[PDB]
Design a protein around this ligand. Structure first.
Ligand SMILES: [Zn+2]
Ligand SMILES: [Zn+2]
Lengths: 201, 201
């Protein structure tokens, strides 16, 4: 495990243009060397939900014209820098707008982290929904196609969720959604099911 | 237009059994005569979302074994009583559980009439969504298959809606969701579009 890592965030709005236009192998390598960096986690998929590579299971950032993920792995590997790859799991904001039925709900029907679409911020998906199948596909694509040094999966953990899918499933399994213990235990199974499916894929 | 009408409600939970088991042509006719009733609006589709006939575009109440709508029209028509037919539009609670993405939202993401699924009551659909296409199909089926004397369409009117579909559509049409006037005017178009499609179908 390398001692000198950078976690390179790239949560980038669809409403910003010319993504990566000022990227260069030379600039990326010079700054890693200036920083004495020997590992840099770079983005395949951000909170806004875009891919930074020409993806078949997800949509590339609509203002990105080239394989930024590919260019970063190559530039770093050519100077002996490892490159783990980041995938946002809990957040996919451009999918949130198409599939709000897959978002987490509390007892009072509230989304997190932000409780409406009329305010800025991100809306967390429930991994007890078919969103899990889309995550596995997208993780599989990145692991097949890119020579990364690992996967960092973000916005995950044991939750308590009262979404339509969870409430139906709890009732069918004889659990009581009004019993907090039952919902906490459901969420322990939901999270373990997600990490088991990731390790097997 | 007949002077002596009854509006016969039939909002019936999936969790009640033996629907219609004590129905009879004789009982239905005796009570219409006791009441001096010359028209009775009967249900094709209730707030809970079930059909009271063996429907191909909607699901029959899961505890109903026979064509209750058909039996009521026949029993009434055979004693000269007209039978308009009721269809819940705004409410379809069993669909609400499958398609929460089609439900109305206020500025703060709240459903109406009831602001969560963890409380009893009904959740109103937005007619700016593909739910409108399902309503037209279901209205078409009832009008084709049954010799009714009219259609009563319930839980409809001009709304203000901030659901994901409405917010995207308003932004694409250059309307401002933060401008109340813009959202009111959008809802006037949404409602007129619904009543125009019903009259044409
Ligand atoms: Zn859930
Ligand atoms: Zn709407």
């Amino acid at each position: 495990m390398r001692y000198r890592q950078v976690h390179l965030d790239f949560h980038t709005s669809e409403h910003i243009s010319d993504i990566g236009r000022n990227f260069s192998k030379k600039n990326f390598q010079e700054m890693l060397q200036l920083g004495h960096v020997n590992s840099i986690t770079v983005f395949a998929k951000c909170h806004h939900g875009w891919a930074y590579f020409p993806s078949a299971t997800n949509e590339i950032h609509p203002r990105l014209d080239f394989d930024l993920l590919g260019a970063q792995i190559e530039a770093a590997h050519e100077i002996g820098v490892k490159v783990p790859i980041y995938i946002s799991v809990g957040f996919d904001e451009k999918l949130a707008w198409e599939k709000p039925q897959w978002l987490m709900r509390d007892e009072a029907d509230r989304m997190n982290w932000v409780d409406s679409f009329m305010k800025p911020g991100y809306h967390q998906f429930c991994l007890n929904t078919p969103y899990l199948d889309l995550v596995i596909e997208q993780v599989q694509e990145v692991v097949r196609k890119y020579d990364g040094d690992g996967i960092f999966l973000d916005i995950v953990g044991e939750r308590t969720c009262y979404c339509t899918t969870c409430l139906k499933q709890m009732q069918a399994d004889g659990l009581d959604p009004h019993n907090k213990e039952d919902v906490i235990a459901n969420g322990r199974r939901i999270y373990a099911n997600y990490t088991t499916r990731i390790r097997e894929a």
